Design a protein around this nucleic acid. Structure first.
Lengths: 127, 135, 37, 63, 103, 143
RNA sequence: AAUAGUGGUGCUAGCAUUUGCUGGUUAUCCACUUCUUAGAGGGACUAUCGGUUUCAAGCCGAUGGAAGUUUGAGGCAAUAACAGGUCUGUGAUGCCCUUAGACGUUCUGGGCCGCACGCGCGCUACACUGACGGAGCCAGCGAGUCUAACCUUGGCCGAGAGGUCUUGGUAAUCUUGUGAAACUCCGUCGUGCUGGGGAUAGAGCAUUGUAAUUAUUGCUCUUCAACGAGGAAUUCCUAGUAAGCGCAA
C-alpha cells in the first residue's frame, strides 16, 4: 500500500510499475544497465523457489547480496550463504517493500564504552 | 504618511487551532509562530489572502481568520505547486498534504516507529540511530 | 601507474607527464625545468 | 490606541532642537516603522526643516 | 607567389634572434613584401612540490619554472625563393613551421 | 541640446521609465510571479509585489544599450548577491533562467530588441528611434 | 603589430536637432604606435647642499628625483650522534614462510567513518558600522578535445537542479571584458537572544558510475534546538604591511 494500493499486489503487478511507486534513485536505477552475470541470482532464485509448505529457504549464491533491490518474489526466505567473511543472514520479512538487499548483514557491532571515561579527549594539559 | 487612530480592538491571544498570537507584528510573521509553516511557506498564502502586507491583529476582518486556514486546508485547490509542500507522495497513501502546528508530531512517530521496531519497508539498518545513539 | 620509488600516490597528473613526485626532483633538470625564484 | 499618537506629536513637535529617530522611540510603543512614519507624515506637514537625508538616516530639524 | 606565414616557438632566447635575423636578411636581399617579427607574450609553467621524500619535517615548498617564447612572421614570395631558404636555417632546440593560409 | 542614453541618472531613470511601463500593462506576466524568486541564492520573493517584474525588464533594456549583444548566460552572471551556504563559506550567485528567458522574449512583441546575426539579442532601429525617444521623454523628468 | 589598439575616409542607425553628441561593422580603405606585448639599450651612486663624530667609517635632516627601509621580494651556498635518506637503490642479507607462495590477482563486505569532555591552524556567530529586498557594476595568474570526450557561450524546456539542439576553441584569437565578492545608493525592518544564528533532523526531484544504505554530493518545503564577546593561559602573519573580501590551478 504505497499509493493507497492493495498491499496484496504481489504477482499481479510487474517490475515496471514497481519502479513507478518508488523513490527517485531506483527510478533511475531501473534502466541503469542490463545486467547478465550480476543477474545470476535471479536465474538461481527460481532454481529453488516456492517448492515447499508454509514458511521457505532460497538457493543463495555467493555474490558481492548487498547491492540489489528487493523483489516482490519473496516470502520468508532466509537468503544468504557465505560470500566472504562478514556473513549476510537475510530472512524475508512478511512483505516490507521497496528497498535494497543490503541493509541486514553485519557491518559494525554496537559496542558501548569499554574504557571511554576520557570521553573524547582531555582538556588543555597541565601537570 | 498619516495618523490613523483605531479603537484598540487588538487581541493578545488568538485562536487558530490552539495558536495564541501576539499580533502586534506583520501578519506573515504572525503565522510563522505556528509549527510546520515558516516564512518560506507563509509568504504566498497572505499574498493569496489579498490583504495589506503591514497590518496588526487589531484591524483584521473576521472572515479572514476562517479564510487563511481554508486556503491551508485546501492547499492544491488554489494553485499551489508540488514543490511547495512538506509531506509528499506518502508511503501509505501516495497523496500530498501539508501540516499544521499541533500535528507535525502526527505522521512522525508512527512513521519512525516502523523504522524503529518493525524492520520496515526500508528501515532495517536505519534501525538503531534514533534508538541507541539518538533515542 | 606506480613508477619507481615507493609511490603510486602523489602523481603529477598535470601537463601529461605522469611522474611520481619523489622521482621528479631528480628528473626535473633534464626535462628542462629549473628554479629561479 | 487613539490619543498616544495624537497629542505628544501633533502638538509637542516644535519643543526640541532637531528631530531624529532617537526622540521618537522614547515611548516603547512607538516602534521602528511607527517612528519612521512619524517624520514621513511630518515632512508633509512642513515643520521639518531638512538638512540632509539618505537611506540610512536623515538630518532633520524643526521649523 | 602566395602570402605565407612562419611561426617559431622555442626556448633558447639567444638562439632565436640569430634565426629571426637571417629570416629577414635573405628576404631583404631579394626584397619581398613582409611584416616584422611580431613577438607574443611568453608562457611560463610552474609546479609547487614540497621538498622532502618522506613527510617528517618543517613545511615550505619549491617552485619550478619553464619559459616558452613564441614569435611569428608573415611573408609573401614566389615559392622557389622560399622553399630553399627554409632548409638552411636549422638549429637544434628550434622549431620551424610554414603556413600558407590565404582564406 | 540633444542627449543620448548615456547622460541621465542610473537608478532614477529606471524608476521614471518603469512607472510609465506601469501605466502600459503590455507585458506577458506569467502566473508564477508570486512564488518564484529571482535565483536560488536569495531567501525571499521581493518586497515589491508587482513592480519588480517591471523593474528587471526595464534594466535589461538599459544594459543592452551600451552593449553589442546579450545572450542569457551573461545576465545570469549579473544580478547582485552572494550565495549563502550556511556554516560553510560563501560563493558567487548565479541567477535563474526561466524568469529571464520569457522577459527577453517579452520585448520582441513590442519592437525593442531582436537577434543579431552574431548570435545575441540586440536593439535595432525599432528601439533606436523609440526607446531613446522615450528616454528623451525622461528629459521632462529632469526639471 | 587583423592572434594588440586608438585616428580618419566611408556604406550606416539614432539624431535636440540645424553645425551636433552617441552608435555602425569585415575587409570601407588609408594613416598611426601614446596606452599593449617583447627584443636592444639607458637610468641611482645615497647624488647635491646643512648639521654631527678621533672630522675617520658612518648616521641624521634637507630640496630634486619613477625610485633614496641592502630601492621592494625571493633563489643560491655544509659543521654536525634523529641508523625516517632505500625502487626494477643493492644493502653494493642467509629466515622476512623469503620457492598447498600468506608477497599475486580477479571475485568478495569490513581501513582513516561509532557514547558524555580536546591542547582540533581560522572556519559560521554572538548584530543596526546589521540583515532582507530592489538597483548601480568593477580583476588578476593560471587551464583546456583525436584515438577522444576537455572547455563551454545563443536557441531551446523547466522553479531551481538540470535536460535537449548547436557551435567556438590546439590557442593573446574561442569560452572570457572570466560582468568575483566585500563595498555602493533606494527601501523594508526595530532591538526582544525577534525577521540576528541555522547547528540535529523527516517528507521529496536530480544528476556520476559496476555500484551511493552508514545520509558520495546538489536544489525543494518544513523544523529553528547550543550560542549575549569568552577563566587560568597563549599567537604560521611587517607599510599597499596587519586585517577583512576572493573563488583561479
Amino acid at each position: 500500500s504505497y499509493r493507497g494500493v492493495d498491499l496484496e499486489k504481489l504477482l499481479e503487478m510487474s517490475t515496471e510499475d514497481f519502479v513507478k511507486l518508488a523513490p527517485a534513485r531506483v527510478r533511475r536505477r531501473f534502466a541503469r544497465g542490463m545486467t547478465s552475470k550480476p543477474a545470476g541470482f535471479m536465474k538461481k532464485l527460481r532454481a529453488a523457489k516456492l517448492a515447499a509448505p508454509e514458511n521457505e529457504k532460497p538457493a543463495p549464491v555467493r555474490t558481492h547480496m548487498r547491492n540489489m533491490i528487493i523483489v516482490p518474489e519473496m516470502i520468508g526466505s532466509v537468503v544468504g550463504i557465505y560470500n566472504g567473511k562478514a556473513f549476510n543472514q537475510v530472512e524475508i520479512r512478511p512483505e516490507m517493500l521497496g528497498h535494497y538487499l543490503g541493509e541486514f548483514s553485519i557491518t559494525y557491532t554496537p559496542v558501548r564504552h569499554g574504557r571511554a571515561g576520557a570521553t573524547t579527549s582531555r582538556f588543555i594539559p597541565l601537570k | 504618511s498619516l495618523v490613523v487612530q483605531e479603537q484598540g480592538s487588538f487581541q493578545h491571544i488568538l485562536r487558530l487551532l490552539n495558536t495564541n498570537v501576539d499580533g502586534n507584528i506583520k501578519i506573515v510573521y504572525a503565522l510563522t509562530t505556528i509549527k510546520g509553516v515558516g516564512r518560506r511557506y507563509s509568504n504566498l498564502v497572505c499574498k493569496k489572502a489579498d490583504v495589506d502586507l503591514h497590518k496588526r491583529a487589531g484591524e483584521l476582518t473576521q472572515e479572514e481568520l476562517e479564510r487563511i486556514v481554508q486556503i491551508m486546508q485546501n492547499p492544491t485547490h488554489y494553485k499551489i505547486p508540488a514543490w511547495f509542500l512538506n509531506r509528499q507522495n506518502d508511503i501509505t497513501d501516495g497523496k500530498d498534504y501539508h501540516t499544521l502546528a499541533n500535528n507535525v508530531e502526527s505522521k512522525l512517530r508512527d512513521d519512525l516507529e516502523r523504522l524503529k521496531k518493525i524492520r520496515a519497508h526500508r528501515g532495517i539498518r536505519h534501525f538503531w540511530g534514533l534508538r541507541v545513539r539518538g533515542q | 601507474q606506480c613508477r619507481v620509488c615507493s609511490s603510486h600516490t602523489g602523481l603529477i597528473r598535470k601537463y601529461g607527464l605522469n611522474i611520481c613526485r619523489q622521482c621528479f626532483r631528480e628528473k626535473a633538470n633534464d626535462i628542462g625545468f629549473n628554479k629561479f625564484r | 490606541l487613539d490619543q498616544e499618537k495624537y497629542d505628544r506629536i501633533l502638538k509637542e513637535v516644535p519643543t526640541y532642537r532637531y528631530v531624529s529617530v532617537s526622540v521618537l522611540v522614547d515611548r516603547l510603543k512607538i516602534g521602528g516603522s511607527l517612528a519612521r512614519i512619524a517624520l514621513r507624515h511630518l515632512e508633509k506637514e512642513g515643520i521639518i526643516k531638512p538638512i540632509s537625508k539618505h537611506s540610512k538616516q536623515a538630518i532633520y530639524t524643526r521649523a | 607567389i602566395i602570402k605565407i606565414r612562419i611561426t617559431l616557438t622555442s626556448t633558447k632566447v639567444k638562439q632565436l634572434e640569430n634565426v629571426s635575423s637571417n629570416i629577414v636578411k635573405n628576404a631583404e636581399q631579394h626584397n619581398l613584401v613582409k611584416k616584422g617579427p611580431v613577438r607574443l607574450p611568453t608562457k611560463v609553467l610552474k609546479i609547487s612540490t614540497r621538498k622532502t621524500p618522506n613527510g617528517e619535517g618543517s613545511k615550505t615548498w619549491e617552485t619550478y619554472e619553464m619559459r616558452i617564447h613564441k614569435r611569428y612572421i608573415d611573408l609573401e614570395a614566389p615559392v622557389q625563393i622560399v622553399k630553399r631558404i627554409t632548409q638552411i636555417t636549422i638549429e637544434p632546440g628550434v622549431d620551424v613551421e610554414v603556413v600558407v593560409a590565404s582564406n | 541640446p540633444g542627449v543620448s542614453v548615456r547622460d541621465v541618472a542610473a537608478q532614477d531613470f529606471i524608476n521614471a521609465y518603469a512607472s510609465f511601463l506601469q501605466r502600459q500593462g503590455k507585458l506577458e506576466v506569467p502566473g508564477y510571479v508570486d512564488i518564484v524568486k529571482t535565483s536560488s541564492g536569495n531567501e525571499m520573493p521581493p518586497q515589491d509585489a508587482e513592480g519588480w517584474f517591471y523593474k528587471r525588464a526595464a534594466s535589461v533594456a538599459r544594459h543592452i544599450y551600451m552593449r553589442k549583444q546579450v545572450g542569457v548566460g551573461k545576465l545570469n552572471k549579473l544580478y547582485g548577491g552572494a550565495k549563502s551556504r550556511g556554516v560553510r563559506p560563501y560563493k558567487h550567485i548565479d541567477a535563474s533562467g526561466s524568469i529571464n528567458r520569457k522577459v527577453l522574449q517579452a520585448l520582441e512583441k513590442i519592437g525593442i530588441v531582436e537577434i543579431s546575426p552574431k548570435g545575441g539579442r540586440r536593439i535595432s532601429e525599432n528601439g533606436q528611434r523609440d526607446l531613446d525617444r522615450i528616454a528623451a521623454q525622461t528629459l521632462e523628468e529632469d526639471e
